Amino acid sequence: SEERKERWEQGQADYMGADSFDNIKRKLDTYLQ
Amino acid sequence: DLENAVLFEVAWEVANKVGGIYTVLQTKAKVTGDEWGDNYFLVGPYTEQGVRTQVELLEAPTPALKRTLDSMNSKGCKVYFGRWLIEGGPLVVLLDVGASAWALERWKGELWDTCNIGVPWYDREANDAVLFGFLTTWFLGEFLAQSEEKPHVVAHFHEWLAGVGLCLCRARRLPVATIFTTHATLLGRYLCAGAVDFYNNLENFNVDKEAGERQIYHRYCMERAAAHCAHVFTTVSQITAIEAQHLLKRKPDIVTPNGLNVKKFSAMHEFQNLHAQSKARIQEFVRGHFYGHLDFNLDKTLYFFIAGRYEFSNKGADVFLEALARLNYLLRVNGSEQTVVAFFIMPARTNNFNVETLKGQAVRKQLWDTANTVKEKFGRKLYESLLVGSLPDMNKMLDKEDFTMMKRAIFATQRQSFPPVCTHNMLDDSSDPILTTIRRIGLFNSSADRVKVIFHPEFLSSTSPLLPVDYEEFVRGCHLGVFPSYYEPWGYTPAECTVMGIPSISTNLSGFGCFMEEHIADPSAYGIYILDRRFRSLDDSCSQLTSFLYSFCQQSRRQRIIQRNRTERLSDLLDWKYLGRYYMSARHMALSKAFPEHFTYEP
Ligand SMILES: O=P(O)(O)OC[C@H]1O[C@H](O)[C@H](O)[C@@H](O)[C@@H]1O
């Protein structure tokens, strides 16, 4: 799980993968607008 | 709503002078300096270079502010509170981005348990933006905590560089209303050239795939996360609002166009007095770039203006070059005396000037010196003729000595080479996109050509050996300012043109052109020609532009002046006093959504 943060470093972040923004949008949704 | 509240304007360009966002907040400070008064602040990065020029340090007025700085001062965060020296009296909160060690590692991991966005170590401003992001949330957090019964806060965030600190304020759940104003879409910039028909395919673009490919996903996520973290998402342009609707995936709640503080004069026609003064200084230049080839009338000549960063596709030089090639035809196949001298003022890498251009400018002063010597010789002979009591003979006035001076001056003037397309000498002349097109279309500044293209490979300056006139004066000199574009988030080059009396050809894809279509009903009548580039093709857009250019070419002396007076009336539309309303509306809207308990709907 902490693997993804390392993947972000060096731009190994996956656009459709683990690092996909759709998860990030739901994560922001936890702090509801 | 009149409630007393403290807001912060957060941007990277605050006391940095890096991008165009600096120029936005330069004159925004005056209009925002009375709407919220002295309560408003500007959170920005700290540079010691920027302090010496722009920042004057001052103590905190409120005791709660004194502690916010002091508590932040402990724990390794340093704030150099001061007042911006720009007009408006903006109190600036300069946080040191140099203080990276205390929170860069800890809060980067804290950022990942919260936003789940990671930062590559390779990208420099990426690590600097997040630091600045946590520092903002710290200041806002302390301000909410140490101020007992804190009024409803607005955090006004500009650019991706502040866009990280947007989500941190929301993540803490701190009582703060949030605004994100993207002056330019990050991914839109690379999508403009990399992906064909970017505006046509704005909906289709795979929004995550494209960012990953341009190795720019982390930056894209921070700006996109910011949209879902602002109760009010704001774009400068309505065309940028369409961009954000299909890329940032957040419809802008309000569109708050950037504005200028117009330098209003005492006479409402002083712009037109500054027209003729600057036109003459351009006339001194084209009477010299061309020597011995000055067959054209410069009193029936027009000057077209195009400026900005050296971007051939973005600043739409490709559209304007193929249009002048057709304007070459229409003013030559038709018996016209109208000559048009288009100026391409775009900065590019250049070792030195050109010998022919410098020689032509020197010859112009030579034919001014040889026209001052025999002028004084005429004058002295006249003064001893008027004093004697006789009107001048007018034939003997100039001796054989004078005639030989003038006859030799003309002989030196004569050139066989056609006057140059580029004023300076380039390192990469063949590789230069503008110069390659010029030789292709067939405009070598010839006698037969009714359009002469005069590229100036570097910015205009007043301290210049050739063309000694600054940009703000040079715009006022030119008759028309043509700005075709594909990716101008907000026209600043066509925007500043319309602030002055000079009419500007904007486009539908430009942010300024969409604003002029929305506000005023009349396009061409008020002066601002708007080019359809969204629902047309590259060739079609060139063809419309030709009809727009030829319309101005067929215009008379008097009709040109009326149009230039009409364009002056549109300066009120771009002024911060009028365009600040939109930002104010964003603020009022932000307060209500985040805190409806004492804030009205304000529909
Ligand atoms: O710019 P043009 O259409 O050639 O007109 C030239 C005119 O410009 C300004 O209005 C000046 O005040 C006039 O003195 C001049 O006659």
Task: For residue B187, give both structure tokens.
Answer: 């991914």
Give per-residue burial for B3-29: e unless 16+ CB within 10 Å, then b.
Answer: eebbbbbbbbbbbbeebebbbbbbbbb
* A9 to chain B, closest Cα gap in Å: 4
Largest CA distance in chain B: 99
Q: Taking the CA of residue B84 as centre, how many other CA atoms within 13 Å lie in the half-sphere pointing to its CB?
A: 31
The CA B276 to ligand 1 mean position distance, Å, reads 6
Q: Which residues of B touch chain A, with CB atoms under 8 Å apart?
A: 109, 112, 114-122, 167, 170-171, 173, 207-209, 211-213, 215, 217-218, 220-221, 224-225, 228-229, 231, 593
**What is the distance between the alpha carbons of residues B484 and B478, in angstroms, rounded to a whole number?**
17
Neighbours of B248 (CB within 10 A): 26
A17: which chain B residues are within 8 Å (Cβ-Cβ)?
none
Interface contact flag, A28 B215, Cβ < 8 Å: no
* B73 to chain A, closest Cα gap in Å: 29
CA dihedral defined by B188, B192, B193, B197, rounded to 10 degrees? 140
- Give the three-class secondary structure for B586: helix
Q: How far is CA B524 from the centre of its chain?
A: 22
In B327-433, the DSSP E strands lie at 339-345, 352-353, 424-425
Mutate which of B217, B222, B229 to disrupt the A interface (most A C-beta within 10 Å)?
A: B217
Instruction: Specify whether the backbone of B356 is left (phi greater than 0), alpha (psi in -120 to 50) or beta.
Output: alpha
Residue in B121, B209, B228 closest to A28 by CB = B228
End-to-end CA distance of chain B: 12
Task: For residue B256, give both structure tokens.
Answer: 């708050």
Interface contact flag, A16 B209, Cβ < 8 Å: yes
Q: Which residues contact B8 (CB under 8 A, 6 or more apart)?
A: B40, B41, B42, B43, B93, B136, B139, B140, B153, B154, B155, B156
Tell me the pairing of strands B82-84 and B55-57. Answer: antiparallel
DSSP B256-304: ----B-----SSTTHHHHHHHHHHHHHHHHHHHHSSS-TTS-SSSEEEE
CB of B276 closer than 6 angstroms to any ligand 1 atom? yes
CA dihedral defined by B148, B152, B157, B162, rounded to 10 degrees? 30
Resolution of the model in angstroms: 3.5
**Residue B107 to residues B119, B131, B156, Cα–Cα distance (Å):** 11, 8, 22
Interface contact flag, A11 B217, Cβ < 8 Å: yes
Neighbours of B268 (CB within 10 A): 12
The CA B560 to ligand 1 mean position distance, Å, reads 9
* A24 to chain B, closest Cα gap in Å: 6
DSSP B180-195: EEESS-HHHHHHHHHS
Give me the sheet containing B82-84, strands edge to edge: B55-57, B82-84, B91-96, B41-46, B7-11, B153-158, B176-182, B232-235, B254-255
Task: For residue B345, give both structure tokens.
Answer: 């003022």
Closest atom, ligand 1, to C-alpha of B560: 3
Closest atom, ligand 1, to C-alpha of B299: 4
**What is the distance between the alpha carbons of residues B137 and B142, in angstroms, rounded to a whole number?**
8
Q: Helices B238-246 and B511-518, interaxial angle, to 10°?
A: 110
Nearest CA to ligand 1 atom 5: B557
**Residue B55 to residues B52, B161, B441, Cα–Cα distance (Å):** 7, 21, 50
Q: How far is CA B540 from the centre of its chain?
A: 26
**Residue A24 to residues B157, B197, B275, Cα–Cα distance (Å):** 20, 29, 54
| Adjacent-strand bridge partners of B575 | B260
Residue in B112, B121, B225 closest to A5 by CB = B112
B112: which chain A residues are within 8 Å (Cβ-Cβ)?
5, 8
Nearest CA to ligand 1 atom 3: B557
Which residue in chain B has the smallest CA separation from A14? B212
Instruction: Select from B268, B272, B281 the residue to mutate for testing ligand 1; criterion: most ligand atoms less than 8 Å from CB.
Output: B272
For chain B, how many residues are written? 603
Q: Taking the CA of residue B409 as centre, how many other CA atoms within 13 Å lie in the half-sphere pointing to its CB?
A: 19
**Residue B25 to residues B21, B152, B371, B463, B599, Cα–Cα distance (Å):** 6, 23, 50, 28, 26
* A16 to chain B, closest Cα gap in Å: 7
Neighbours of B465 (CB within 10 A): 11
**What is the distance between the alpha carbons of residues B459 and B234, in angstroms, rounded to a whole number?**
32
DSSP B481-525: EE---S--SS-SHHHHHHHTT--EEEESSSHHHHHHHHS-S-SSS
Residues in chain B after which the chain is broken, C→N over 2.5 Å: none
CB of B364 closer than 6 angstroms to any ligand 1 atom? no
Closest atom, ligand 1, to C-alpha of B479: 1
CB of B560 closer than 6 angstroms to any ligand 1 atom? yes
Residue with tokens 């605050």: B14
A4: which chain B residues are within 8 Å (Cβ-Cβ)?
116, 118
Q: Which class for B64: exposed (0-12), middle (13-18), buried (19 or more C-beta within 10 A)?
A: middle
- Give the three-class secondary structure for B43: strand
Task: For residue B92, give both structure tokens.
Answer: 């600036």
Query: What is the gyration radius of the CA atoms in chain B, in angstroms?
Result: 28
Phi, psi of B7 (to 5 degrees): -120, 160
Residue with tokens 């596709």: B313
Largest CA distance in chain A: 32
User: Do the Cβ atoms of B508 and B484 come closer than 8 Å?
Assistant: no
User: Do the Cβ atoms of B147 and B174 come closer than 8 Å?
Assistant: no
CA angle B57, B61, B67 (to 5 degrees): 90
**What is the distance between the alpha carbons of residues B169 and B182, in angstroms, rounded to a whole number?**
18
